[PDB]
Design a protein around this ligand. Structure first.
Ligand SMILES: *[C@@H]1O[C@H](CO)[C@@H](O[C@@H]2O[C@H](CO)[C@@H](O)[C@H](O)[C@H]2NC(C)=O)[C@H](O)[C@H]1NC(C)=O
Ligand SMILES: *[C@@H]1O[C@H](CO)[C@@H](O[C@@H]2O[C@H](CO)[C@@H](O)[C@H](O)[C@H]2NC(C)=O)[C@H](O)[C@H]1NC(C)=O
Ligand SMILES: *[C@@H]1O[C@H](CO)[C@@H](O[C@@H]2O[C@H](CO)[C@@H](O)[C@H](O)[C@H]2NC(C)=O)[C@H](O)[C@H]1NC(C)=O
Lengths: 127, 154, 99, 136
């Protein structure tokens, strides 16, 4: 240490191969939300390509991202074969709600609308 | 009670594998003692060991894995076997579940110093046979530390 | 990991020969009839671990350190001199002489 | 059968929106992981019965680990970890209020010894005692 930061050491932040990506955002938001095969959900700065907020997960398959969708400003993810569903606030860089689901293999993820606005999530498992 | 394990030796000019039966090991699992009953070397075997020693060959021991499911074997410089007056020790290492793991042979003293050896020396097998079960490693010592810190606090 | 007490544990094995070396000119694995004595000691590490590798210097003059890789992401530099197995359970004059 | 560990985490003087971006709650050394939501609280799911040390890892501000014992029936409790004499119990409320202890101290300050430190040199005294001996 010795408070000689950056004189000799250097760190590089790397996410894995981009399994699922989301580019749709406000023009001034300048954000990419990407979940990789390394179980990593990260936000990349559009202008320069740097990490804004990164949330790593369990190395094993028990935390693998299986489906991403984006709505408005928060990105919604499913992990551990449909066991957990999370909502991440892309601006702050944290969760909004984390909900466990019942057993059964996840097969498809989508949104629903009542009359004019999307308000619920339809998640389908094999049963 | 007692289980018998075969034990073969081999030594050749070409240092190949020509294992021949040498001795039986009576491993009594109850008291954990092992005793070997080998036959003494013959004239031709003594000669073969002499040439193997001359060429700095190897003396290989081999035992079956089970009392023909496999074998566990090792080797020792045969010229060091003959320069130690046929004084050696073979240790049988097993595991916690009581399965044969390996055999390790080593002479006494090791190495070689060019000592010429007469034939009459090689009519005895001064072999020390031991069985080595896995030694339990000690866990961290907590009682001594807590009592010592209690005395320090008081 | 130690399941009985639920705590990560180290265990240092140090190999020591007798007071006099068997051979100094050269070392041969075929000429080692003396089984080296083993010194063991188990310590408690208060966190998990992810990767270890000792610090290596060209001539080995510099003391040895273990680079403990914690899950948090830090890299602890644990001194190997702390993990000595000869640290007595009761200090004596010999220990004080050796510090 | 499967239970969840709840809790909170607040750093005094700093809003959560500034530090929760790169903080993870670890249940027993990465064997379970969770992420803190916007307000600062955290929830970890899929926890079987046993004993687990929960720590809020964050490079900005450290957090004191807290042990949590959950039983098969469902009752579950929190306490202070102690790897020595583990039989002790020091109860801590379950809605873990793991208040931070400020930024950690990865850095060590420079020595910057002064002349007043040079004043009482053990070497100077141990080499001037012979000087008095040399005179006498
Ligand atoms: C990691 O530590 C370094 C060093 O303490 C931080 O860099 C400091 O950032 C503050 C904030 O602007 C500056 O005032 C200091 O001058 C920086 N230090 C140096 C040596 O330049 C860095 O911000 C820390 N990283 C995080 C994510 O907090
Ligand atoms: C140490 O081990 C060596 C190797 O087994 C012994 O043999 C010596 O090896 C060196 C290097 O090749 C030769 O120069 C010597 O001539 C060898 N000595 C003999 C007697 O042949 C060596 O003897 C061992 N040292 C001691 C003190 O026993
Ligand atoms: C038979 O082999 C044993 C080894 O198991 C020899 O015992 C060693 O003897 C030497 C001196 O003769 C001692 O320095 C060693 O300490 C002994 N070893 C053990 C383990 O006690 C024994 O001498 C050999 N017998 C003959 C006739 O050579």
């Amino acid at each position: 240490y010795e408070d000689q930061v950056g004189k000799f050491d250097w760190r590089q932040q790397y996410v894995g191969k981009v399994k699922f990506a989301s580019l749709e955002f406000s023009p001034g938001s300048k954000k990419l939300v990407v979940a990789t095969e390394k179980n990593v959900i990260a936000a990349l700065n559009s202008r320069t390509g740097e990490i804004l907020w990164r949330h790593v997960d369990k190395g094993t398959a028990e935390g693998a991202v299986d489906a991403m969708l984006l709505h408005g400003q928060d990105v919604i993810t499913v992990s551990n074969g449909g066991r957990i569903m999370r909502s991440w606030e892309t601006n702050i860089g944290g969760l909004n709600w984390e909900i466990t689901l019942d057993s059964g293999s996840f097969q498809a993820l989508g949104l629903v609308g009542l009359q004019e606005s999307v308000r619920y999530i339809a998640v389908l498992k094999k049963t | 009670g007692t289980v018998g394990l075969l034990l073969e030796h081999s030594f050749e000019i070409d240092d190949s594998a020509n294992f021949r039966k040498r001795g039986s090991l009576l491993w009594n699992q109850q008291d954990g003692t092992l005793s070997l009953s080998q036959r003494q070397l013959s004239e031709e075997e003594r000669g073969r060991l002499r040439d193997v020693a001359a060429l700095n060959g190897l003396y290989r021991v081999r035992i079956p894995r089970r009392p023909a499911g496999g074998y566990v074997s090792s080797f020792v410089p045969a010229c060091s076997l003959v320069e130690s007056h046929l004084s050696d020790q073979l240790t049988l290492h097993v595991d916690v579940a009581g399965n044969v793991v390996g055999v390790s042979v080593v002479t006494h003293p090791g190495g070689c110093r060019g000592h010429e050896v007469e034939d009459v020396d090689l009519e005895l097998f001064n072999t020390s046979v031991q069985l080595q079960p896995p030694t339990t490693a000690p866990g961290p010592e907590t009682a001594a530390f807590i009592e010592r810190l209690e005395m320090e606090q008081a | 990991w130690n399941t009985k007490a639920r705590r990560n544990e180290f265990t240092v094995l140090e190999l020591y020969e007798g007071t006099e070396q068997y051979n100094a000119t050269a070392f041969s694995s075929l000429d080692r009839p003396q089984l080296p004595q083993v010194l063991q000691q188990s310590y408690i590490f208060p966190s998990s671990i992810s990767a270890m590798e000792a610090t290596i210097t060209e001539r080995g003059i510099t003391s040895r350190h273990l680079l403990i890789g914690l899950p948090s992401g830090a890299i602890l530099s644990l001194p190997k001199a702390l993990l000595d197995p000869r640290r007595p359970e009761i200090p004596t004059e010999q220990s004080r002489e050796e510090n | 059968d499967r239970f969840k560990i709840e809790g909170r985490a607040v750093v005094p003087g700093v809003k959560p929106q500034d530090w929760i971006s790169a903080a993870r709650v670890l249940v027993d050394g990465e064997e379970h992981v969770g992420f803190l939501k916007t307000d600062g609280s955290f929830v970890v799911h899929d926890i079987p019965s046993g004993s687990y040390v929960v720590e809020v890892v964050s490079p900005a501000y450290r957090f004191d680990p807290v042990r949590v014992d959950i039983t098969s029936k469902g009752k579950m409790r929190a306490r202070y970890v102690n790897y020595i004499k583990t039989s002790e119990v020091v109860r801590l409320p379950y809605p873990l209020q793991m208040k931070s202890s400020g930024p950690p101290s990865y850095f060590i300050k420079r020595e910057s010894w002064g002349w007043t430190d040079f004043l009482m040199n053990p070497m100077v005294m141990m080499m001037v005692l012979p000087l008095l001996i040399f005179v006498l």
